[PDB]
């Protein structure tokens, strides 16, 4: 037998960094969870018990903290690029570094209407993420995403005109609840290396902001014909607003809310126009996905 593919490293590395402004007293915190997996001339660790080719995953962990100490950890696209570039440059025989970063929210508290200098709240489990693949000889591929953005609209969602055959029981509807957990990913043009990534640093926060804003506004304003149609509009707009993005991907569950017929109880009317109480369904759920690119 032979090794067709291999990568190894340290996952679930929790990192916090604080920035203190000496002059203002304002402190800023960042918290993330980091995974770094390396590829290279490491097949003999698997086939021959040759650990000489292994950069220990414990050392990869140390390196993550040292890199956070010596560089900015924001935007996560830049940090991941610095981190991955380090491994392929430091170790001749390592030829790719795969860096995934989950950024956790720490939003400054407002106390009595004034931003507090050093207290924060996790104002959502929504995440901002990056996947940075640093490949020697082939630059840096970055996928940026937002995930865990949980939303609901109580009307202005429809689903009718779908295929109807002997497997179909679903009633057409012109007014339903739509609720989802948004997973949205924008894939950047390949970057030739760390300098090119750095040359675009401002665009990373800007594009994340645009993607979120477009997601929320389209979700709220689209009188939705379906999840499919709504998510395409989101993707289309994001592409139109950042030329350095090549594709936009959405992965959306349809978290169903079912009407409850109560007419069996004293003729209570709770369906159609009289629907007020619904049963949220934990499972199953629709799952709808789209990758949109430039025509």
């Amino acid at each position: 037998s032979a090794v067709k593919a291999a990568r190894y490293g340290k996952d679930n590395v929790r990192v916090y960094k604080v920035h203190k402004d000496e002059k203002t007293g304002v402190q800023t915190v960042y918290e993330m969870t980091v995974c770094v997996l390396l590829e290279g001339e490491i097949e003999t660790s698997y086939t021959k018990a040759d650990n000489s080719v292994i950069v220990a995953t414990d050392s990869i962990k140390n390196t993550i903290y040292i890199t956070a100490k010596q560089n900015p950890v924001t935007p996560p696209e830049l940090f991941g690029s610095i981190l991955g570039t380090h491994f392929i440059e430091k170790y001749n025989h390592i030829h790719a570094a795969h860096v995934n970063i989950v950024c956790h929210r720490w939003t400054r508290m407002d106390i009595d209407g004034k931003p507090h200098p050093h207290s924060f709240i996790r104002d959502s489990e929504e995440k901002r993420n990056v996947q940075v693949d640093v490949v020697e000889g082939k630059g840096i591929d970055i996928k940026s995403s937002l995930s865990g953005l949980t939303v609901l609209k109580s009307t202005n969602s429809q689903f009718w005109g779908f295929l109807r055959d002997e497997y179909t029981t679903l009633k057409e509807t012109w007014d339903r609840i739509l609720s989802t957990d948004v997973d949205a990913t924008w894939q950047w043009k390949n970057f030739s290396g760390l300098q090119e990534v750095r040359s675009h640093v401002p665009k990373f926060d800007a594009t994340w902001a645009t993607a979120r804003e477009v997601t929320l506004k389209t979700f709220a304003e689209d009188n939705s014909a379906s999840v499919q149609a709504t998510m395409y509009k989101m993707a289309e707009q994001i592409l139109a607003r950042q030329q350095l993005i090549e594709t936009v991907e959405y992965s959306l569950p349809n978290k169903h809310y079912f009407e409850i017929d109560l007419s069996w109880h004293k003729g209570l009317q709770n369906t159609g126009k009289n629907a007020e109480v619904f049963a949220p369904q934990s499972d199953p759920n629709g799952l709808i996905k789209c990758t949109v690119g430039r025509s």
Copy 2:
């Protein structure tokens, strides 16, 4: 043998309710998870296979939705009281109803700076909860709480002067991170029944708001001597601001963030005054609890 205690019912009942203002088009949503457990003359269901004394848990589920259809679901203290009162009044032989409600956040979205009439965001996994125990002959006991409120302050937390003996390795500190998940509970004076609960309806949202506000402000402003001392201040203030509360309980984990000594690497300084990168510890964690009452 004999039954010393018994209660039974339906847990994890997910409920959504929408309120539509016909005139404005503004819709408002509520989502909760409900548990109702009943007590009464039901020992024979356990000892004699006598199911005649059982109100089926499926029927308790139906009753939850019907009650939500026919009454306000807010404040959760009132809904739980209505619900529990129904079971003990409807069924002679049922003498207590234990209603736990978890309220989930659905905060109206602001789109282009204007509140949207029917789109919402889950802007936190923080919960507002109630535990309502309706006991025939003995009124209604309500415990209200907030939970899952996750906060961090990056300085103005201290821990020194603790007991030091042969089991102690912890260094005293005058400047550390403090991060916790706030679980705060306020226990109301017994209410004689549903009318008395209704007579106090406005106080339920007001007291929840006060508890949150006092929690966040004390957390942010107290140069903390310890979790113990900070949480007591929170509780003291809440008691001072609502005379219908008898006790205030806090349950707080201390979610440790550890310094990382990196001086082994090129003499890097990352401790004490130079501490910038920390390792959040998932476990273990301190757990600190207090119940505060009136002197």
Copy 3:
């Protein structure tokens, strides 16, 4: 205000211990998660920032590992007793120690039909637990339990003869699925202190074994009239087999499996006697509880 109740300490302390038999080469592992919360003359830590009365939770963590190093960690009832007794004896001003222990399964692997000397498998997420409350002047109260024991029987479960009124839609059934996650707790006679606990050491593993055996056999053999009736039988038997137990508590969810009517599709028959495919319901679920004592 004033402190009405207080306890504090370290939660989620993961502990592993290995026992190596030098002579046989057979190794045995134990893994648990420990929480120790202390009570005593500690009110001033909360009201006066007096940390002198605080045994740091970090030191409580150290003490957990030291105690595991110097004593047996099995049965967990004994370990918890040793641990809690240490705190109230070591610290004059500490008057109670509350020790919760979750034991994780590490079952020796059989390889080619022979037990392996040092490899183990987690052959279930089922837990064996103890709650040991050590109260100065008042001995040691122990609650032992098994939890997370997930079972299903595909027939020989019934539910009929329950109360029927205007809230009832549930059909009576003479043949249904019953599936639950067993949480079973046996509460021991108070022990006067550590010597008395030690005098009963063998009974702890024996009683845990009996409780599990009786649970599984009753579940499998009882043509169940209801969860209520079945769980009472379990409790009755356990009480009859260990006189040092005062009560037996069960907490059982009824994890419903619903029939699926498919006759709308080509007259397919999948209900009643023809029921083969069912939909497991994640929520809601019945929750049925009983505490049984001696008449």
Copy 4:
């Protein structure tokens, strides 16, 4: 813009099936969670609100239950193939079906040493899974796996001889704990369609059994030089025992157990040869992956 990729359907479809032997009274249960995502000429649902091309995900759910009613649900490789083949054959314009199945354990209980005819225990959260991609014109690609198989060996694991530089703090060790959650995947030769899958039905349970057996035996018997080296041996053997498998993939976390130096306390010796009490680390963890193919 334009749709570069799209797939949609129903996730988290829980399914139970019972088989009753009329003659013996022996019943057998299967429980799984199913996801079916379809691809085809569906771009206009996204770009033009054309729902005519959508097979509703609700109908895909119905179809899952109907297929389970009318066919065997075991081995999961065959069920997934039947299910995916149905969609591409039934709907001209659907050209791929992606079926993921998670099988949940329901192992027959032994009561008083005899297998019970209709009671089962979930004797592990370990899963048996399939990923079946049915592509019109291109047959059926199946990946089979086991996951969630959690194991520990308390000695006969080593890690030394790794790369040492300025980022390295890890001590070499000749005797450590190794614990992991096994994720192992075997990828089958492409099948031309449903007949070819059926022609190999017996091999699916046999190969799953071999993979598990080889995993457990190698884990227990290999005096491991590293995770890398041990997992390669597992993969090598599995490939040697089933020629219809093209590759074998492992994904293994190294769930670290750290020594605890206690010599600061009364010179207690708990390291090296005296190590008995360890601290399991929840995070971070190494993550080691390998795909092995035929040379």
